[PDB]
Design a protein around this ligand. Structure first.
Ligand SMILES: [K+]
Ligand SMILES: [K+]
Ligand SMILES: [K+]
Ligand SMILES: [K+]
Ligand SMILES: [K+]
Ligand SMILES: [Mg+2]
Ligand SMILES: [Mg+2]
Ligand SMILES: [Mg+2]
Ligand SMILES: [Mg+2]
Ligand SMILES: [Mg+2]
Ligand SMILES: [Mg+2]
Ligand SMILES: [Mg+2]
Ligand SMILES: [Mg+2]
Ligand SMILES: [Mg+2]
Ligand SMILES: [Mg+2]
Ligand SMILES: [Mg+2]
Ligand SMILES: [Mg+2]
Ligand SMILES: [Mg+2]
Ligand SMILES: [Mg+2]
Ligand SMILES: [Mg+2]
Ligand SMILES: [Mg+2]
Ligand SMILES: [Mg+2]
Ligand SMILES: [Mg+2]
Ligand SMILES: [Mg+2]
Ligand SMILES: [Mg+2]
Ligand SMILES: [Mg+2]
Ligand SMILES: [Mg+2]
Ligand SMILES: [Mg+2]
Ligand SMILES: [Mg+2]
Ligand SMILES: [Mg+2]
Ligand SMILES: [Mg+2]
Ligand SMILES: [Mg+2]
Ligand SMILES: [Mg+2]
Ligand SMILES: [Mg+2]
Ligand SMILES: [Mg+2]
Ligand SMILES: [Mg+2]
Ligand SMILES: [Mg+2]
Ligand SMILES: [Mg+2]
Ligand SMILES: [Mg+2]
Ligand SMILES: [Mg+2]
Lengths: 203, 50, 116, 148, 116
RNA sequence: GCGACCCCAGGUCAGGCGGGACUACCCGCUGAGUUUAAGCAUAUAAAUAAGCGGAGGAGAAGAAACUUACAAGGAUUCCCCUAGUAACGGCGAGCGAACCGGGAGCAGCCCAGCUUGAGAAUCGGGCGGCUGUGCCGUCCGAAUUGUAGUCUGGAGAGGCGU
RNA sequence: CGAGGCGCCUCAACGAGUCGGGUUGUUUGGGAAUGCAGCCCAAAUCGGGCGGUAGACUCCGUCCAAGGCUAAAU
RNA sequence: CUAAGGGACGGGGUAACCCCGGCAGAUAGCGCACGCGCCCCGAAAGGGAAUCGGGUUAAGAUUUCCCGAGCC
RNA sequence: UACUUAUUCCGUGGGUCGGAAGUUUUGGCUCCAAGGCCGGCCGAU
């Protein structure tokens, strides 16, 4: 078993070995399009834990997304409203960069279904993720009882409904009990339940 | 104009057929409430904007 | 590489040889002669053309062009058209002026069809 | 695509390469490599047809322990830690280099002879695959004890 | 006329009937524009006969093709359902489970019991 | 020059998948102001309307990196109660849940990691056959940069017996 | 017409630019900071996350994240 | 056919709707294996293959039908 | 303070870069090699 050695090495990102290898790769990704199909995961050990298998029907894509916050896209920085809503520049997108990357991949590849994604690189302006997608029309997927669930119609475009691992992170579903109870079943479902005026017939 | 697209002429032909009086025997049917065409148009009034 | 410019090389491409036909119904000529030649015109203006210019007037399909018209009159009435003039009427239908070649008498053809 | 692969070779030449990566530059000598590979050809695993034929031959009766090269990174890594590897052959061009960059350290720590040879595709050909990326010898035949 | 007899006739006879009824509907459309009083109701009778013949010819063609193709089926011959039904997993695929789940059903299925 | 691989290119190549529509319910983003504060800027309106997307017959959630402080309970969801309460708030106007308890309904599972090496034992496709949502045979390919099987912390592997 | 259960006894592997911390914005009833997000720092394995007031030390209670599926009550 | 201009493959941006055409990307092909290689839309007043005279209807043809005579 | 490969900018139909060795004419034309030596080399380092 060699996967532990690979996993342990990738924990030392600040070593000379990992810094050199990441720097050459970061340069090469900069000369490629923002959505690129790759024949093999760069981090096979990290891909195994996230569900990837070396089978026909599993495909891997590298996605490049821009870093930083979300400037308000209003015509001149001009807001017509109260000063609490007049900020422009220091605002933040509610979804993470990992979900943005796999959401770009899902829109580009409508015939495939996103499994999940993992972090690959970053320099200053770009972050790189590799997204695992499944061809749910291939018989290898359709015959594997561990990935069969992805072929069912309720799992269409789960990256767009916040149902991947990255989506559960920004939805507040990576914790339980108090500090997280308002996010289940969803925050909007919780809010609607607390807005209800229950007028029973015997009151 | 004299210069017409085919699609404009085809629509003008249908509008020509549609502004006729209703047949007289329609008023004789068993449960009939139709009196007139209710959709006659005269070219000088009520232009069709094409 | 005598050129400093790279061009995409020429590669072999095969033709389509499907494993099953997408359409299995043969496909039937729905614009046959009976659709092309609907009926002749019998107005007073149309009847004048028979003895003045050896011409038969027909109501024809909108999809029928001049070539299909002369082929249709040949397969329907065994007569040869010298030329075909067509128009679309203000009622939306298509009207064809079919002038027969000399040695064909439209009045005799009109008698066989039944319009006279 | 041609420009990016040529610039990748130049960038790796200009940038200071850490020793754990620079060690893959030192490869087995050409004379030694042709000796080892001509001996590794003796212990090739059976191809698909040969395995099918051996299955049929057993079925006709209804064998012996074979001596073949071992391959696969997970399997070779397991053998080395179990102290059963007698020789480890590592390809010099594993594209994710973190797959085998620690391998010379593990083999040296476990007191196992190892070498780095040019060509994962050459290692793959021996085991009827493409890009084996590591080969292991645990046992050799008595006819080869002196040569090995 | 008498679709039961139409199903008996061969394909050459069925197309010969189709030709006759097309010639005869044309003779009526000529009569309709000139004059008549009881040839006008023949239009409905004969137009329906043309539909009747073409239905029989078509139904024979499809049944023949369905017999000749029982490998890959032509796209028009394939089972037409809703688009979502066609994308569904098979029962073999829906009922497949892995070994660790098949074992637990073999060794520990739900039992039939009662309380005294 | 013959070759092996890697990365990539072109195909009306063989077989396939996607785009749009619908609005009551559901999932994701984005996001006001009128209004109230007897003025008004925080606050409120409101994590609402509008705006951009994604599904299904339900959706989402879900099997503790949970509560508690007890003699402790034991996935998710919904109802009652908790409770107009703790808290928050020009502590102003206002706002505002959760635990316990009682009900409805109950169900727990699958992987990655070390774990074939006396044999990739796995999978797809073409073709043929048949007992036909599949099974078998043969030939190609995928895969060792890892398919199958074992294992998932409640464990488990190994050893010894019903 | 082999495997599992059970009784007894030396290994026992469990998910990383992730957790966590700082700061900035937003959101919350969550108040020396409820969740989320951007950026900077950046893990561990006699360890890690919690015990609704920030801190250090000593005990105690309690869980094991960062992979996936899951009917019913609605 | 091109004009002012418009759309638009790849690529870039963007939560998405959508916004960007010179940013150069193996430019997707043309002649006779060999040779070469610097998208569309947009004008019935711009550019532009080729027709004349006479006759004819209730209503056409100011060059479309008829007669004759040409042209591309 | 130096370096060049990141990054940035400029140019070209990416058409003679680095090291060594050894056409001024008058508003005209200039391409697809003659020749030499064995498809091949020089001519055209
Ligand atoms: K087969
Ligand atoms: K484990
Ligand atoms: K905060
Ligand atoms: K603890
Ligand atoms: K023009
Ligand atoms: Mg007017
Ligand atoms: Mg109007
Ligand atoms: Mg005309
Ligand atoms: Mg095809
Ligand atoms: Mg849609
Ligand atoms: Mg006020
Ligand atoms: Mg007031
Ligand atoms: Mg006011
Ligand atoms: Mg709305
Ligand atoms: Mg539906
Ligand atoms: Mg669900
Ligand atoms: Mg658990
Ligand atoms: Mg609870
Ligand atoms: Mg009370
Ligand atoms: Mg509120
Ligand atoms: Mg609650
Ligand atoms: Mg209770
Ligand atoms: Mg592949
Ligand atoms: Mg395995
Ligand atoms: Mg076991
Ligand atoms: Mg035991
Ligand atoms: Mg932060
Ligand atoms: Mg803050
Ligand atoms: Mg917001
Ligand atoms: Mg406390
Ligand atoms: Mg974990
Ligand atoms: Mg999980
Ligand atoms: Mg779920
Ligand atoms: Mg119900
Ligand atoms: Mg043009
Ligand atoms: Mg222009
Ligand atoms: Mg675009
Ligand atoms: Mg044009
Ligand atoms: Mg002009
Ligand atoms: Mg006139």
């Amino acid at each position: 078993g060699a996967y532990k050695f690979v996993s342990e090495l990738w924990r030392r990102k600040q070593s000379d070995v990992m810094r050199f290898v990441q720097r050459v790769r970061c340069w090469e990704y900069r000369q490629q399009p923002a959505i690129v199909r790759i024949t093999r995961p760069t981090r096979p050990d990290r891909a195994r834990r996230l569900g990837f298998k070396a089978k026909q029907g599993y495909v891997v894509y590298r996605i490049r997304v821009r870093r930083g916050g979300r400037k308000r896209p209003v015509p001149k920085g001009i807001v017509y409203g109260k000063p609490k809503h007049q900020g422009i520049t220091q605002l933040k997108f509610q979804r993470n960069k990992r979900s943005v990357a796999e959401e770009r991949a899902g829109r580009r590849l409508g015939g495939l279904r996103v499994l999940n994604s993992y972090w690959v690189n970053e320099d200053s302006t770009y972050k790189y993720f590799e997204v695992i997608l499944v061809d749910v029309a291939h018989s290898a997927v359709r015959n594997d009882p561990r990935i069969n669930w992805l072929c069912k119609p309720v799992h269409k475009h789960r990256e767009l409904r916040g149902l991947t691992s990255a989506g559960k992170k920004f939805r507040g579903l990576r914790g339980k009990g108090h500090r997280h109870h308002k996010n289940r079943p969803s925050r909007r479902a919780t809010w609607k339940r607390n807005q209800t005026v229950s007028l029973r017939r015997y009151r | 104009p004299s210069h017409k697209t085919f699609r404009i002429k085809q629509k003008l032909a249908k509008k020509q057929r549609q502004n006729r009086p209703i047949p007289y025997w329609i008023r004789m049917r068993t449960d009939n409430t139709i009196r007139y065409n209710a959709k006659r148009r005269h070219w000088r009034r009520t232009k069709l904007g094409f | 590489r005598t050129s400093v410019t790279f061009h995409r090389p020429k590669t072999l491409s095969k033709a389509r040889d499907p494993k099953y036909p997408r359409i299995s119904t043969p496909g039937r000529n729905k614009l046959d002669q009976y659709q092309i030649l609907k009926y002749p015109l019998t107005t007073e203006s149309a009847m004048k053309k028979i003895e003045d210019n050896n011409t038969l007037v027909f109501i024809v399909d909108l999809k029928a062009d001049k070539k299909k018209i002369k082929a249709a009159v040949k397969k329907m009435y065994d007569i040869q058209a010298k030329k075909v003039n067509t128009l679309i009427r203000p009622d939306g239908k298509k009207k064809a002026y079919v002038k027969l070649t000399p040695d064909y008498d439209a009045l005799d053809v009109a008698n066989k069809i039944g319009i006279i | 695509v041609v420009r990016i692969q040529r610039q990748r070779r130049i960038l790796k030449q200009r940038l200071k390469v850490p020793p754990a990566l620079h060690q893959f530059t030192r490869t087995l000598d050409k004379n030694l490599a042709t000796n080892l590979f001509k001996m590794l050809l003796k212990y090739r695993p059976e191809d698909k047809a040969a395995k099918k034929e051996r299955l049929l031959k057993r079925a006709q009766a209804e064998a012996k322990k074979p001596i073949v090269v071992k391959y696969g990174l997970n399997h070779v890594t397991y053998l080395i830690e179990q102290s059963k590897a007698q020789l480890v052959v590592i390809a010099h061009d594993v594209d994710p280099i973190e797959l085998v960059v620690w391998l010379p350290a593990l083999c040296r720590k476990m007191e196992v002879p190892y070498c780095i040879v040019k060509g994962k595709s050459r290692l793959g050909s021996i085991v009827h695959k493409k890009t084996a990326s590591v080969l292991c010898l645990t046992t050799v035949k008595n006819e080869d004890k002196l040569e090995f | 006329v008498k679709a039961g007899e139409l199903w008996n006739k061969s394909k050459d006879d069925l197309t010969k009937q189709l030709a006759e009824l097309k010639t005869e509907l044309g003779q009526l459309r000529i009569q309709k524009v000139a004059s008549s009083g009881s040839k006008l109701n023949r239009i409905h009778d004969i137009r329906k006969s043309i539909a009747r013949v073409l239905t029989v010819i078509n139904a024979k063609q499809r049944a023949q093709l369905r017999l000749f193709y029982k490998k890959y089926a032509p796209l028009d011959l394939r089972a037409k359902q809703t688009r979502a039904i066609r994308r569904r997993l098979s029962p073999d695929e829906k009922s497949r489970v892995l070994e660790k789940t098949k074992k637990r059903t073999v060794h520990f299925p739900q039992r039939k019991f009662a309380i005294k």
